[PDB]
Design a protein around this ligand. Structure first.
Ligand SMILES: [Zn+2]
Lengths: 28, 21
């Protein structure tokens, strides 16, 4: 349930998946 | 909702694409 540790992974996954389209990361 | 949706349960690359620009 450590969202901060989870978020670190999420951002790396989005980097790979989104590639050149990029993304907005909002910790809502 | 990405934190809610993908931290408790595993998200596929298919689900993750919904969050791209
Ligand atoms: Zn980790």
């Amino acid at each position: 349930v450590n969202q901060h540790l989870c978020g670190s992974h999420l951002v790396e996954a989005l980097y790979l998946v989104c590639g050149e389209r990029g993304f907005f990361y909002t910790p809502k | 909702g990405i934190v809610e949706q993908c931290c408790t349960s595993i998200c596929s690359l298919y689900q993750l694409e919904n969050y791209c620009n």
